């Protein structure tokens, strides 16, 4: 018995439509008053109030933010994510934003591997709005998997989603295209941001970024404008080629290389005028710091589906939030 969704289509003017996979059967509903309500016989699929404002493109640079929490690579593990957030009191008993005016930075990779991808997406979409309502903010950054899915690289999509692509009659990448609520939401997000003296991105920044004289604004804009480009077009343009692949911000794993040095790291820190760089992408056994904590790895292997951790940046300290709800100071 499989339940999945909803997959919401949002036209320019028209009313939105929701597709639900319920017991391997398709259910289609017309959204009224921006309220996405699940049909009868559709298990416990997520229901959410559609928002216009959270699809607005937001700045990629922030100052004077008192508290920030970072985590990454949920990879469809909703239960783990929810447990971690409740244990660390980021959300309340009902699973609603409880971080006040704080900012959350999810450095990408919600998609793939896991079996609760839509659960994670709709939850994050809701948090996005709830955070804004509280005067806080949710920074959902695009990871390499978000780029892969939207672009058509489906090698890591969980097999259970073949049901959806079959019933809704369209490939997985089109289940999150520009005509879908989630797709529109994702296409408004940044890929690299800076909060206070910290830089955040999925993989990491390599020296090539400096060679190309890139800026957060130019990069984030290109990412949004080309996430739907053909692989041919992306690899043809050497700038887009760098941004979207191997040595780029969403794929670079150099910070976890044996040959990478703190000296080289310093040149990168100095280039952005930051003291730390928070990255996901390369899975660790726990949230940890490298090079005297100049780099903080926040991919705590939530993808494994058993546990996860987060990073809390407040009062100039770097704190590790364990799955059991306890904390350990890194710096
Ligand atoms: Ca990942
Ligand atoms: Ca990744």
């Amino acid at each position: 018995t499989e339940f999945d969704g909803p997959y919401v289509i949002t036209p320019i003017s028209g009313q939105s439509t929701a597709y639900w996979i319920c017991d391997n059967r398709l259910k289609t509903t017309s959204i009224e008053k921006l309220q996405v309500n699940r049909p009868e016989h559709c298990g416990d699929l997520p229901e959410t109030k559609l928002s216009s404002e959270i699809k607005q493109i937001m700045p990629d640079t922030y100052l004077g933010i008192k508290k920030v929490v970072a985590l990454s690579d949920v990879h469809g593990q909703y239960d783990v994510l929810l447990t971690l957030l409740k244990k660390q009191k980021i959300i309340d008993s009902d699973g609603n934003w409880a971080f006040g005016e704080g900012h959350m930075v999810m450095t990408g990779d919600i998609f793939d591997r896991g079996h609760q991808v839509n659960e994670v997406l709709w939850f994050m979409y809701q948090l996005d709005q709830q955070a804004r309502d509280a005067g806080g903010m949710v920074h959902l950054l695009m990871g390499n998997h978000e780029q892969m899915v939207l672009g058509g690289d489906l090698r890591y999509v969980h097999q259970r989603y073949d049901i959806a692509t079959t019933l809704i009659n369209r490939p997985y990448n089109k289940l999150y295209g520009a005509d879908t609520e989630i797709g529109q939401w994702l296409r408004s997000k940044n890929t690299i941001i800076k909060i206070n003296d910290v830089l955040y991105m999925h993989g990491g920044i390599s020296s090539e970024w400096i060679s190309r004289e890139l800026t957060l604004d130019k990069a984030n804009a290109l990412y949004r404008a080309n996430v739907d480009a053909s692989k041919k077009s992306l690899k043809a343009d050497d700038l887009l080629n760098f941004l979207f692949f191997g040595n780029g911000p969403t794929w670079y794993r150099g910070y976890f290389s044996e040959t990478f040095t703190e000296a080289e790291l310093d040149t990168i820190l100095q280039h952005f005028n930051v003291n730390h760089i928070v990255v996901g992408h390369t899975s660790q056994e726990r949230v940890l710091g490298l090079f005297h904590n100049k780099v903080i790895a926040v991919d705590s292997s939530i993808k494994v589906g058993k546990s996860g951790e987060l990073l809390l940046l407040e009062n100039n300290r770097l704190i590790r939030g364990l799955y059991d709800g306890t904390r350990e100071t890194l710096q």
Side-chain angles (χ1 to χ4, degrees), residues 46-326:
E47 300 179 302
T48 134
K49 173 58 177 298
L50 296 187
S51 165
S52 63
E53 73 182 21
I54 63 171
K55 293 195 289 187
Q56 295 174 168
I57 299 170
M58 308 301 289
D60 62 24
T61 297
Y62 300 85
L63 284 166
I65 304 308
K66 283 92 72 179
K67 64 181 182 181
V68 181
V69 63
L71 63 172
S72 185
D73 299 81
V74 176
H75 284 299
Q77 299 295 158
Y78 172 79
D79 298 330
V80 174
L81 171 64
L82 199 71
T83 297
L84 170 57
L85 296 184
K86 288 174 179 179
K87 284 293 179 182
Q88 288 291 158
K89 295 185 172 58
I90 306 303
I91 54 180
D92 60 20
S93 47
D94 297 317
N96 299 152
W97 179 266
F99 203 52
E101 292 183 355
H103 290 203
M104 170 184 284
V105 181
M106 184 170 275
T107 58
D109 276 12
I110 282 178
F111 286 89
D112 298 347
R113 295 198 169 76
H115 59 304
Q116 317 181 107
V117 179
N118 285 131
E119 284 70 21
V120 179
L121 293 171
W122 285 117
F123 166 67
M124 288 309 296
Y125 178 105
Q126 182 170 77
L127 265 202
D128 199 341
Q129 179 64 73
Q130 287 176 170
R132 179 163 174 166
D133 288 348
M137 207 177 318
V138 169
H139 298 282
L140 175 51
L141 305 185
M142 298 287 283
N144 66 128
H145 281 268
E146 278 68 41
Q147 290 173 163
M148 293 161 82
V149 168
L150 277 64
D153 182 354
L154 319 169
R155 293 174 300 165
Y156 307 83
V157 178
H158 191 292
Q159 182 184 58
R160 73 180 302 261
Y161 295 114
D162 282 350
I163 296 296
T165 63
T166 294
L167 288 179
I168 305 174
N169 193 213
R170 51 203 299 177
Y172 193 83
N173 55 116
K174 292 303 176 185
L175 240 34
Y176 299 99
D179 60 338
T180 69
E181 182 69 9
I182 295 301
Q184 298 163 185
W185 173 59
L186 290 173
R187 291 179 170 67
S188 73
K189 304 304 179 180
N190 293 304
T191 304
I192 310 168
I193 64 175
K194 179 186 178 183
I195 299 179
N196 301 162
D197 58 342
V198 187
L199 198 68
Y200 305 74
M201 79 271 71
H202 188 61
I205 304 299
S206 59
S207 290
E208 187 173 333
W209 168 283
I210 301 181
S211 304
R212 296 181 173 286
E213 309 173 311
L214 283 159
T215 64
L216 298 204
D217 180 79
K218 182 159 169 289
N220 286 317
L222 286 171
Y223 276 128
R224 278 188 287 278
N226 295 279
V227 69
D228 289 300
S230 58
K231 189 180 180 177
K232 272 289 186 300
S233 59
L234 298 177
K235 317 220 73 175
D237 186 83
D238 69 294
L239 196 177
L240 296 179
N241 183 56
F242 162 69
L243 292 185
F244 283 77
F245 306 113
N247 201 52
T250 57
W251 286 88
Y252 187 59
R253 304 178 182 283
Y255 302 155
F256 306 87
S257 174
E258 299 179 288
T259 56
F260 189 73
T261 69
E262 177 156 344
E264 169 162 42
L265 179 60
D266 291 321
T267 70
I268 298 178
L269 288 176
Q270 184 64 196
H271 185 265
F272 295 92
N273 189 192
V274 291
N275 289 137
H276 307 283
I277 300 177
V278 179
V279 307
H281 191 49
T282 309
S283 312
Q284 305 303 136
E285 306 298 6
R286 60 189 159 66
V287 165
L288 56 78
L290 297 167
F291 311 104
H292 296 71
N293 296 157
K294 292 175 176 177
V295 163
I296 307 299
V298 296
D299 175 352
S300 60
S301 298
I302 290 176
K303 68 182 181 179
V304 181
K306 297 191 70 293
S307 66
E309 297 180 356
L310 54 76
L311 172 69
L312 181 177
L313 306 91
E314 190 178 15
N315 304 305
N316 273 164
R317 296 194 308 180
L318 296 178
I319 297 173
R320 174 190 171 206
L322 292 76
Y323 197 55
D324 68 354
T326 63

Side-chain angles (χ1 to χ4, degrees), residues 12-30:
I12 71 302
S13 288
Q15 173 186 61
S16 290
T17 298
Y19 292 102
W20 313 76
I21 303 302
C22 317
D23 219 314
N24 304 310
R25 298 126 189 182
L26 179 62
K27 299 299 178 186
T28 305
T29 58
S30 299

